[PDB]
Design a protein around this ligand. Structure first.
Ligand SMILES: O=C1c2c(O)cc(O)cc2O[C@H](c2ccc(O)c(O)c2)[C@H]1O
Ligand SMILES: O=C1c2c(O)cc(O)cc2O[C@H](c2ccc(O)c(O)c2)[C@H]1O
Ligand SMILES: O=C1c2c(O)cc(O)cc2O[C@H](c2ccc(O)c(O)c2)[C@H]1O
Ligand SMILES: O=C1c2c(O)cc(O)cc2O[C@H](c2ccc(O)c(O)c2)[C@H]1O
Ligand SMILES: O=C1c2c(O)cc(O)cc2O[C@H](c2ccc(O)c(O)c2)[C@H]1O
Ligand SMILES: O=C1c2c(O)cc(O)cc2O[C@H](c2ccc(O)c(O)c2)[C@H]1O
Ligand SMILES: O=C1c2c(O)cc(O)cc2O[C@H](c2ccc(O)c(O)c2)[C@H]1O
Ligand SMILES: O=C1c2c(O)cc(O)cc2O[C@H](c2ccc(O)c(O)c2)[C@H]1O
Ligand SMILES: O=C1c2c(O)cc(O)cc2O[C@H](c2ccc(O)c(O)c2)[C@H]1O
Ligand SMILES: O=C1c2c(O)cc(O)cc2O[C@H](c2ccc(O)c(O)c2)[C@H]1O
Ligand SMILES: O=C1c2c(O)cc(O)cc2O[C@H](c2ccc(O)c(O)c2)[C@H]1O
Ligand SMILES: O=C1c2c(O)cc(O)cc2O[C@H](c2ccc(O)c(O)c2)[C@H]1O
Ligand SMILES: O=C1c2c(O)cc(O)cc2O[C@H](c2ccc(O)c(O)c2)[C@H]1O
Ligand SMILES: O=C1c2c(O)cc(O)cc2O[C@H](c2ccc(O)c(O)c2)[C@H]1O
Ligand SMILES: O=C1c2c(O)cc(O)cc2O[C@H](c2ccc(O)c(O)c2)[C@H]1O
Ligand SMILES: O=C1c2c(O)cc(O)cc2O[C@H](c2ccc(O)c(O)c2)[C@H]1O
Ligand SMILES: [Cl-]
Ligand SMILES: [Cl-]
Ligand SMILES: [Cl-]
Ligand SMILES: [Cl-]
Ligand SMILES: [Cl-]
Ligand SMILES: [Cl-]
Ligand SMILES: [K+]
Lengths: 257, 259, 259, 259, 260, 259
């Protein structure tokens, strides 16, 4: 019988591999994914929201930049509990959505990271408010390649990478949670959000300041983040606010006139 | 102090024993029951909804057919925890509502069936993977409880080995789902809840009446024909649509009157 | 350029000619008709709502009883202005909906009754000052149009001098209201819309069937008994509650499916 | 047929003549007045809202200070068109509400002040261009009507030549706005509505009491001090905030009770 | 990892120490506090609401009467779990709000911030069980108390329930009495009890909470001469509120829309 | 007194001249513009919405492509009526917003294009009857105004006799719609607004760039290629989806920040 109280925040990195797919993928998301979703999890999800990603910045491709959105659920129970596999009504989820997102064409894994509802580490910019200004919120998840010691990767991240973020005045905030791997075997290890004022601030720090970094022995590309795009790193730059707070705001797929 | 996280889906089988009562019972439900309810459980119920039952089909009376609605709560805690008996404001619940629902007559009355379930169906026995796009569903929700002194394991075995296969054989039946009732919560006499989908009333009839004549009449039967259980006492049911506009936590804006 | 301020209340009498059609027609209405509709007229309709009809009462068939609902719009402009025919996105309206409503068979076929009215009742002939606290109302909404070649003044005189007094005499009848149909808008064949309240179905029957036998059968009668008009062609009706949860502009949150 | 497009903003000055009445009057307003109201005018009112008045300031009694709220409707048509008198469902409006508001006593009562205005202020006499970021406003809304047999032109001249300049001189006063009352609608005795903003109650006092002592007492004065008009009869007022949570068409979700 | 399921009802006693502050404090609450709040706790709070207090009644000052509102959260987890201190976006909460509420003087002794955690359901129902909304409009006097330092808690409880409550039960003017014990283990709130005591109106409140209560033995630990015998705003806070608020913030809020 | 019933649809072409400005401009729009706006026009605007533009396509710069959104109001009265200039609270509109949108540099600046239209399209030139089920639309909304000293009738003739036929010839173009700009309202320099649908960006390109090379370059042309008009000055545009979540009158619940 018993079901564990397991409050978590999920993030899904929704890419769009081509502008010709955008109308169709966007349609599916807003016309189909929302109602199918709420139909299933309304009673045990407290917040379902989409954060459309800003235009892909220069060299964003190398950070597995999700060109469509982030998809953010707040769960009261583990959606991977086997008993939750049973649904009266099932979702409409065509093959085509996976083509559009880039799961299918070599093809890219579906990154679904589970987190505790609150950030575990606050490494810069504590006490910042909304009045302090509009944030270019760079959300990035990473997973160290196979056969790399996790403790060693953690040590690299926090002792080599983060200090560069702390040094940069262009970087207003740094936050990190460790991925709940015990839930869905997500290959990612960390999720970070790193705020800037704008795209140029992002570039200056995440490209130029980061050239200073020693290229690690396990690197899957020459430059930071040294991890395989869309496979061992995904990301998105998003705004402080979304109008797509789906549990509160959705009123059907109303069409423009 | 401690309060156990106990996520459940409740169903109440709301009958209406006479069309002359319908205006008044419907009024109570939508004008009074909703605000009184939300006033009490808003902080620990995630979804409160009413699914109006379709017109009672031929021989529906024999399945304890609730002629008004199903009432569906999603709980985060056991509403039968004794500490939850204390309410600043109490509900308005007249005698008359029980007359209307058939709990009391003008000449024997009917129990109030309030079944607690896990939020997710336990058994998916037909039609897995069906979506809303596959078409409009005549959703026959039926709960049953085996008569007193009938072994539960034996009743389970009957249900799943004799009854369900007839549903599986029938092309008219698009879906079959079952959960075992949480009896430990409120001593509900029912044992199972099933939802059995059809295309329409005729599909329902063809299977639940005609195909079911084939069944061996069990020794404990309380009526001659399937479901072999006493209407409204050991079986209640309702046929409902996929969608309700009465999703009360989101949708309610007061008892606004027609012009 | 100029667009006339034309505040009106529309009523559409939505029938359902068979229970096997109900799931599918209900689906279309709530899953498709609503969003397609709001997509088009949100900026110039102040209220869009559906009032599900109560179960068809005995002999309701003879009053063109809409077995599904009433569909009620409040317009700021004439939807029949020719310039309003152009829509970026058009509605999905299958042939099948007309089968289900009885506009076509799959056994003669019934017109689509869409009556335009002023937003306020023109005549208040009984029960003025009645409030919601006075009790739950069985609201019988009925529209009528006199057969071809019948003088309109003469029909009016019949209605108000012969019919209405029987309603006024009956204590079972709590309210009587009437507006004259705007015929100048969409050529609707109906002439009047009335709402006649009772306590319940039996009150309705006692008055609209039994008390009405007393009436002189007029020379133009299209059937033996009141209302003396051809069902679904020259009379449509529905009995509805004071309240609907389907106040679509405020309440709709998508076609969310039961679990 | 034709109904004139008449966009207006109404204000009703809702007093509460005793603290012992506040619970009951407040209940009526929020439990009964809202749903009865929306039930009637939803299709032709674009905004219905209540602005609770701040605590009555010193000597506010002399300005006909409404100790409960302002009631603010935005109309698309004249509610005083005679055809709008007919309502299917009528409102619940007990005698007691009039006692509570002070229309009737337990020993002379007070008129019901219902002022119709154009939706936009006619005169902007101070503080043009002020935004919400400029700070929180103590908004003193005051309506006045000159006693019987006082020339209106002469009263206007007094107001704009003697009164207004004192407001303009006072740095404590951040804003001055005025519309002339639509008298042609409901024969409201009032002539002007003004809103006069301060930072706080003391600012209000300093200007509307102390600075105003400077004023010549006019020959028609109905009291010794400004505003020289009979409280609640020829002057009503209220001090309100920039924001109300009671924007009733958008926000109302029923009379949900505290736990 | 694990986070405990801890369903609770919080109450915050929001005072306003001067009418000249009311516009500004009210603005902050409705323009800023709400969105900043929902931005943080939307996923684990089921109900966030404000109950504006009725006008301070005669001698209400002596009961630590919050002249602005009550602030009522329903939590699914302990907001005082240390891991909940981390927020992406932090709240805007100026010094000035503390001046307005009376936590600080503007340039000199202030008043503590009373934030009481409770179980979601009342623990004791001591009068008026079964009363409905149809029974009439309620003057709901919510009052929290905490016994002075070095007063035995069991002894204070015994005083409250054996001396005070019977006066409430005797008074026909008092329609309801409810009490929960404060969860002290959560945030070290100095208060011990929260009670709600209903009347018909302000005069009913006065007749009972002032006049009937004169009958009471003045305890040895008393911090003022008259009931409630506790230091205003420090060891007792209160508010009289209506059955209904329009500020049910999770459901109702549509932005800080300004009057025209 | 009188206020004319003037139902209209406005469009504002909101550009964003640099990605470094997007966070800040987007913030202003969603945090400030919305509440300031609703605070002013809630009672006489039936729909306020934002349609975020898709990524600027190849050579979109030449069509005055608004890189932020379209801003769409539905008015019941002319916002340019002089009496509507008076507002109690005024809007917060920094210099910086004009920098971000490109009205000013920190080169050469760009006019603020605010086009008023009838609520319904005047000309339906292709794809009549198309529904939402027919598929997802790349909706290219484009407004144009003919250079100074060009006869308007002659420009109209060019548009409908030369340009539109190319759209009609292209199977890649699923829809063509046009309204004439109400110039009598706000002296907007634009003359027409068109919406031209494709399947996707490539369809847009193939037709609006490649097929359009076929066109005779007119004598008044302000650039070599179609649309032959000065970007952002005599032509603005945006490609948008069928649906926006930013339907501000229904959906806005404050500036809630991500966690
Ligand atoms: O319930 C689910 C769901 C849904 O209800 C609606 C919807 O529109 C998409 C969905 O997608 C979820 C999903 C599918 C495949 C995966 O590989 C995965 O990780 C998650 C699925 O579980
Ligand atoms: O919006 C969502 C979403 C999406 O936008 C894109 C995508 O590719 C998959 C998705 O799937 C999400 C989901 C739904 C139900 C579940 O039970 C679940 O685990 C995940 C869904 O809500
Ligand atoms: O909270 C409750 C409640 C309520 O608040 C409002 C309302 O309108 C009806 C209600 O009915 C519930 C109930 C009553 C009698 C029973 O015999 C039973 O099992 C359940 C009760 O629990
Ligand atoms: O709609 C409801 C309902 C109803 O429609 C019919 C009926 O006969 C009883 C009911 O009672 C339900 C209820 C309310 C509060 C509770 O705490 C509870 O356990 C049950 C109520 O919500
Ligand atoms: O706007 C319209 C419309 C719509 O927007 C949505 C929808 O779901 C059905 C609709 O149907 C309307 C209609 C009126 C009269 C008829 O005789 C008929 O076939 C159809 C149509 O005009
Ligand atoms: O619900 C509705 C409805 C319906 O339920 C049944 C039906 O058979 C036709 C309908 O059509 C209505 C309609 C839509 C658009 C219009 O422009 C119009 O005048 C009427 C629609 O709103
Ligand atoms: O319909 C109305 C109405 C209503 O629907 C609801 C309500 O709660 C109060 C109301 O009161 C209005 C009114 C009554 C008496 C007057 O003397 C007056 O000037 C106005 C009336 O118009
Ligand atoms: O809030 C309202 C209100 C009120 O709060 C107090 C009061 O004493 C009268 C009132 O009457 C208002 C009203 C309703 C309908 C009308 O047609 C009308 O003209 C006025 C009502 O809505
Ligand atoms: O002392 C004050 C003050 C100040 O010292 C400096 C300054 O730049 C602006 C100010 O303006 C404040 C204010 C004025 C009018 C209001 O209506 C309001 O809410 C606030 C006031 O507090
Ligand atoms: O001494 C003064 C003064 C005064 O004598 C009386 C009075 O009633 C108000 C006053 O206020 C004046 C003032 C002007 C501008 C401000 O911004 C401000 O705070 C105050 C100031 O000149
Ligand atoms: O008496 C007053 C006064 C004064 O006499 C002298 C002085 O030097 C300043 C003053 O300033 C006060 C004031 C000004 C503007 C406000 O906006 C406000 O609330 C208060 C005013 O009342
Ligand atoms: O800049 C700000 C500020 C500041 O710099 C210093 C300081 O001591 C207080 C402050 O407080 C401002 C504020 C006042 C009242 C409110 O109601 C509000 O939301 C914010 C804030 O903006
Ligand atoms: O998160 C919090 C918060 C917030 O987000 C928004 C807001 O407008 C007020 C707030 O106030 C809370 C608080 C303040 C002072 C205290 O002394 C205290 O105990 C708690 C704080 O925790
Ligand atoms: O309304 C609220 C509020 C208030 O009105 C006044 C005040 O002085 C403090 C407040 O603080 C509340 C709060 C408490 C705990 C939190 O963890 C939080 O985020 C916010 C906030 O919700
Ligand atoms: O009311 C208005 C308004 C507003 O309320 C809020 C807001 O955030 C921006 C605004 O801008 C509008 C506007 C700006 C520039 C123009 O050139 C023009 O014609 C109109 C203005 O009218
Ligand atoms: O969103 C809007 C908007 C905008 O988004 C961007 C922009 O650059 C100007 C704007 O101005 C619009 C406006 C407001 C009030 C009015 O009276 C009016 O005519 C226009 C506003 O609503
Ligand atoms: Cl039998
Ligand atoms: Cl909601
Ligand atoms: Cl016949
Ligand atoms: Cl709404
Ligand atoms: Cl005169
Ligand atoms: Cl060129
Ligand atoms: K060319």
């Amino acid at each position: 019988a018993d079901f564990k109280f397991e409050p978590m925040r999920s993030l899904i990195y929704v890419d769009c591999v081509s502008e010709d797919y955008r109308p169709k993928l966007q349609r599916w998301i807003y016309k189909v994914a929302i109602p199918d979703s709420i139909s299933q999890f309304e009673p045990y999800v407290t917040k379902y929201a989409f954060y459309p990603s800003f235009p892909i910045p220069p060299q964003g491709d190398r950070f597995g930049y999700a060109r469509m959105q982030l998809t953010e659920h707040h769960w009261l129970v583990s959606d991977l509990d086997p008993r939750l596999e049973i649904k009266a009504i099932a979702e409409t989820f065509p093959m085509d959505v996976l083509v559009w997102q880039g799961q299918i064409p070599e093809g890219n894994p579906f990154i679904f990271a589970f987190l505790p509802m609150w950030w575990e580490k606050d490494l810069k910019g504590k006490g910042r408010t909304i009045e302090d200004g509009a944030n270019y919120r760079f959300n990035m998840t990473i997973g160290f390649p196979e056969g790399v010691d996790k403790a060693e990767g953690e040590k690299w991240l926090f002792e080599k990478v983060v200090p560069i973020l702390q040094a940069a005045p262009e970087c207003t905030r740094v936050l990190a949670s460790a991925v709940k791997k015990d839930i869905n075997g997500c290959v990612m290890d960390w999720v970070l959000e790193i705020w800037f004022e704008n795209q140029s601030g992002w570039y200056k720090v995440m490209v130029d300041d980061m050239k200073a970094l020693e290229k690690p022995s396990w690197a899957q590309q020459d430059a930071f983040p040294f991890l395989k795009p869309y496979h061992n790193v995904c990301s998105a730059a998003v705004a402080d606010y979304t109008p797509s707070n789906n549990l509160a705001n959705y009123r059907g797929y109303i069409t423009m006139r």
